[PDB]
Amino acid sequence: DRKLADAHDQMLELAELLTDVLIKNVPGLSEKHAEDASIYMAKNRAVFAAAFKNNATALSELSE
Amino acid sequence: VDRKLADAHDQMLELAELLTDVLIKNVPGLSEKHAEDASIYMAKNRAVFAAAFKNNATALSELSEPA
C-alpha cells in the first residue's frame, strides 16, 4: 500500500537524478532517451548495484 | 601495484561493454553511440554509481561537473 508507494518514490527519485547526470555527460543524448534509460536502470537497481559493485556479469540477471 | 590498475581498467571496459549491450537491448530508440558513451561514463565512475544504486541516489552528487 503506502509502504509500496514509497518503493516507487525511491525508484523515481533515483531515475530523476540519473536522468540529469546523463543529460549532463552524454553529448547529444535527448532528455527523453536519458529518462527512458534512467527509469530502466533505476527500475532494476539491485541488479545494477551488484554489477557496478563487484562484477559486470550480474547483468545476466536482467530478464528479457 | 600497476598490474592492479591494469586489471581495473580492463574491468572498466568489460563493464562498459556489457552495459552498452543491455542498454541497446532495453531502451527502444537509444542509439548505439549514445549507449556506448553513457556506458563508458558510468563504468569510469562505477564506485559512485554502485553507491547510488545500492542506497542513496544522492551519492551521484559526488560526480564532478563535465569536462
Alpha helices in B1-67 (DSSP H): 3-26, 32-44, 46-54
Q: Experimentally, how was this structure solved?
A: X-ray
Sign of CA dihedral A20, A16, B53, A34: negative
Resolution in A for the shown PDB structure? 2.5
Q: List the single residue in B with minimal CA-CA distance to A35.
A: B27
Chain A partners within 8 Å of B38 (Cβ)? 22, 25-26, 29, 37
Out of A25, A45, A56, closest to residue B14 by CB = A56
Question: How far is the C-alpha of B10 from the C-alpha of A31, rounded, in Å?
Answer: 30
Residues written for chain B: 67
Alpha-carbon torsion angle B51, B3, B17, A44, nearest 10? -20
CB B42 within 8 A of CB B65: no
- Residue B49 has phi, psi (to 5 degrees) of -70, -45
Distance from CA of B6 to the nearest CA of A (A): 16
Coil, strand or helix at A1? coil
CB B18 within 8 A of CB B45: no
- Number of neighbouring beta carbons within 10 Å of residue B32: 10
Domains recognised in chain B with CATH numbers: 1-67 (1.10.10.710)
- Residue A44 has phi, psi (to 5 degrees) of -115, 35
Terminal-residue alpha carbon distance, chain A: 28
